[PDB]
Design a protein around this ligand. Sequence first.
Ligand SMILES: *[C@@H]1O[C@H](CO[C@@H]2O[C@@H](C)[C@@H](O)[C@@H](O)[C@@H]2O)[C@@H](O[C@@H]2O[C@H](CO)[C@@H](O)[C@H](O)[C@H]2NC(C)=O)[C@H](O)[C@H]1NC(C)=O
Ligand SMILES: *[C@@H]1O[C@H](CO)[C@@H](O[C@@H]2O[C@H](CO)[C@@H](O)[C@H](O)[C@H]2NC(C)=O)[C@H](O)[C@H]1NC(C)=O
Ligand SMILES: *[C@@H]1O[C@H](CO)[C@@H](O[C@@H]2O[C@H](CO)[C@@H](O)[C@H](O)[C@H]2NC(C)=O)[C@H](O)[C@H]1NC(C)=O
Ligand SMILES: *[C@@H]1O[C@H](CO)[C@@H](O[C@@H]2O[C@H](CO)[C@@H](O)[C@H](O)[C@H]2NC(C)=O)[C@H](O)[C@H]1NC(C)=O
Ligand SMILES: *[C@@H]1O[C@H](CO[C@@H]2O[C@@H](C)[C@@H](O)[C@@H](O)[C@@H]2O)[C@@H](O)[C@H](O)[C@H]1NC(C)=O
Ligand SMILES: O=c1cccccc1O
Ligand SMILES: [Zn+2]
Ligand SMILES: [Zn+2]
Length: 446
Amino acid sequence: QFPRQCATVEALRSGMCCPDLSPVSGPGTDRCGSSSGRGRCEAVTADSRPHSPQYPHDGRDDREVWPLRFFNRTCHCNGNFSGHNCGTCRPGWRGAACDQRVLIVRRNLLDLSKEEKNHFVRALDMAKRTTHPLFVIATRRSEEILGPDGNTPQFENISIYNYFVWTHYYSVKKTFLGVGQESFGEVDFSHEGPAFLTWHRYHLLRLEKDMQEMLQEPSFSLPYWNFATGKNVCDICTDDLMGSRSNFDSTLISPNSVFSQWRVVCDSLEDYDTLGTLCNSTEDGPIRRNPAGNVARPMVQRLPEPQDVAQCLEVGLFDTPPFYSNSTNSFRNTVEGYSDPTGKYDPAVRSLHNLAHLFLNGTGGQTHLSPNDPIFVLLHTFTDAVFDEWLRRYNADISTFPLENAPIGHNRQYNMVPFWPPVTNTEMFVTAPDNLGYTYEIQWPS
Ligand SMILES: *[C@@H]1O[C@H](CO[C@@H]2O[C@@H](C)[C@@H](O)[C@@H](O)[C@@H]2O)[C@@H](O[C@@H]2O[C@H](CO)[C@@H](O)[C@H](O)[C@H]2NC(C)=O)[C@H](O)[C@H]1NC(C)=O
Ligand SMILES: *[C@@H]1O[C@H](CO)[C@@H](O[C@@H]2O[C@H](CO)[C@@H](O)[C@H](O)[C@H]2NC(C)=O)[C@H](O)[C@H]1NC(C)=O
Ligand SMILES: *[C@@H]1O[C@H](CO)[C@@H](O[C@@H]2O[C@H](CO)[C@@H](O)[C@H](O)[C@H]2NC(C)=O)[C@H](O)[C@H]1NC(C)=O
Ligand SMILES: *[C@@H]1O[C@H](CO)[C@@H](O[C@@H]2O[C@H](CO)[C@@H](O)[C@H](O)[C@H]2NC(C)=O)[C@H](O)[C@H]1NC(C)=O
Ligand SMILES: *[C@@H]1O[C@H](CO[C@@H]2O[C@@H](C)[C@@H](O)[C@@H](O)[C@@H]2O)[C@@H](O)[C@H](O)[C@H]1NC(C)=O
Ligand SMILES: O=c1cccccc1O
Ligand SMILES: [Zn+2]
Ligand SMILES: [Zn+2]
């Protein structure tokens, strides 16, 4: 969603989201930091190439050709400057001139020290309570975004971590067709398509960045959870980490973990998909988590085996037609978990990433809701670690990431929805240590 400077009547009317950086001569005098050389307000590029025939409602959904339904001009920054303002630096760069290299290391959560484990847990908790300094979220779609009286932007403040939940929600929600009509659900701007891995990579980079600024610790890094152990249990679900099971309710988190106090956002689908509203910042209800608990679905009662990871990393093409959840021999569909680890499609199979979600048999395994469970962060840095090893191993071969006829949202040059500033899948399709300022301390099975 959008910088608070752009969630106004004026900015949405002008179609321009190009905020000032240091307005020393008055408002509008330093848009995108043009006073210095940091950037310039510029026309948006959005993907205009066709998508797969599965989405038939072109013209109906604000996520199409993102961000054009809200803004057609944004800040484009020069050099290694970056941000909605061009006021910060691109990943891997710090300093006023964006010329100092940083490399942060994402490590296995179980390898952290007693203190490092405690620091991480409290930092997640701080992000859950701390208002995001920059972004606000919409509670209405574009037709109602200026509110009933036409002068009241329908945006809410939201915490650093709940923004992380909301953007995942917004990417997966159904297309609203109107009161009385059933919303359309064969659409997903962050799953079931090639954008899945790059979407989720930016997802993590933006949370990590937000927490660095919240903590004022430039080197803070999100750890990972090696869920590919074949285990029957959740080895990070302990009270010094992500929280153990409640002895008073098998589906709740131990009261001796702060995460039992969290309350989730976006759990009112029945309202959103009938009234046409969007998830707002009001929390409601605790995290439900029940590892291995899906007795009705035995396939999701055990986690992935180690070799599952070693096998999926031998799939050498990033994606294959039809670039969807039923692709075969697609690395993306394999690690996403709709193929078996060799790449062989099967409508039944759930493996790796999908399996790790469903193993939680709770909030973490529901599509509109799953970042509400903070295991999500660690589940996806590990998924991102596998992706990064693939990028290393096959020379970041983006050729099979399709430029057209992908499911809507997944064309290569699509701006990933709804991140801001606009950022394409291509911008994330790079090896992380040289291009994004982070690397993984990890070892792979042979
Ligand atoms: C760039 O956008 C302006 C502003 O319009 C907004 O932009 C989009 C997000 C879309 O949602 C528009 O409906 C928004 O109003 C465009 O100028 C407006 O054009 C409309 C007709 O299309 C007109 O009724 C308004 O008066 C115009 N507003 C202003 C301030 O002139 C502009 O045409 C767009 N330029 C492009 C796409 O190149
Ligand atoms: C993958 O699933 C898709 C969508 O369910 C199937 O693709 C086509 O879908 C269009 C409408 O989107 C229909 O005309 C057909 O059902 C599909 N085209 C065919 C069968 O030629 C597709 O069949 C699936 N791919 C597989 C199973 O390999
Ligand atoms: C924030 O979201 C909640 C959940 O959708 C909204 O509360 C619902 O509002 C509908 C109709 O207004 C009621 O029928 C439901 O019973 C409400 N749910 C709950 C849990 O109270 C709430 O109105 C939204 N806030 C804003 C400002 O839109
Ligand atoms: C957690 O697992 C239970 C089953 O172990 C799920 O409940 C089952 O849901 C299916 C499909 O909705 C029903 O056919 C079964 O009758 C249910 N069984 C029981 C014992 O409840 C539950 O939906 C799962 N929850 C999540 C979030 O995954
Ligand atoms: C959102 O909240 C605004 C508060 O602005 C600032 O936000 C963070 C950084 C906190 O430090 C807070 O204390 C600050 O004041 C309010 O002005 C307003 O209620 C909200 N604005 C909108 C558009 O919803
Ligand atoms: O976001 C998800 C939520 C629930 C289950 C499986 C896979 C997901 O990516
Ligand atoms: Zn997801
Ligand atoms: Zn996921």
